[PDB]
Amino acid sequence: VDMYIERAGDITWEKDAEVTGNSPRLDVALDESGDFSLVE
């Protein structure tokens, strides 16, 4: 198994970008394995 990289673009902001998605506020915890979980 070999892993390889291919260039896909410049890192640039785009003025004509699609705009979507909410902005939820969530309480979370981050454990030692890097996993986020919800907290109540």
Binding site: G21, S23, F36
Partner: protein, 148 residues
């Protein structure tokens, strides 16, 4: 070695396992994408240099270089690179992961798993973190940033 956003591919057939950012001669991606494996770039090889499972981050060829942070008020852009699709910018206002150790921006965007490592940008075009470590409430990704 050229600055830019890259697909991370693996080989019967090729598949895209993730995405990363080349900047200042260092390749940045998420630990869960490569698990630290060396990466081929042309005839060259990129070796891991730093990584951390709890942050879910890994850098190749040098130390982590990305240090911009979400300003907490402005819209951002996910530069998503989905498998089989041209790089595309998705604008959004982040929500917030509230943790005992402070607030982290989060984006409520759900792209295929091979999109993990795609950069999130601020209005100046700086990388404020990477996409693909998060929680389900619908998936919400932390804006994961390392330390420079």
């Amino acid at each position: 070695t050229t600055d830019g956003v890259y697909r991370v591919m693996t080989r019967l057939g090729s598949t895209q396992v993730g995405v990363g950012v080349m900047q200042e001669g260092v390749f940045h991606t998420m630990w869960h994408v490569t698990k630290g494996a060396a990466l081929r770039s042309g005839e060259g090889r990129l070796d891991p240099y730093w990584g951390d499972v709890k942050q879910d981050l890994v850098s190749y060829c040098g130390p982590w270089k990305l240090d911009a942070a979400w300003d907490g008020l402005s819209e951002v852009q996910l530069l998503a690179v989905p498998p089989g699709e041209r790089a595309k910018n998705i604008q959004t206002l982040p929500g917030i992961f509230k943790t005992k150790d402070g607030d982290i921006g989060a984006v409520a965007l759900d792209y295929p798993a091979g999109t993990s490592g795609s950069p999130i940008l601020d209005k100046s075009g700086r990388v404020i973190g990477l996409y693909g470590n998060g929680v389900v409430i619908s998936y919400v990704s932390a804006i994961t940033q390392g330390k420079r």
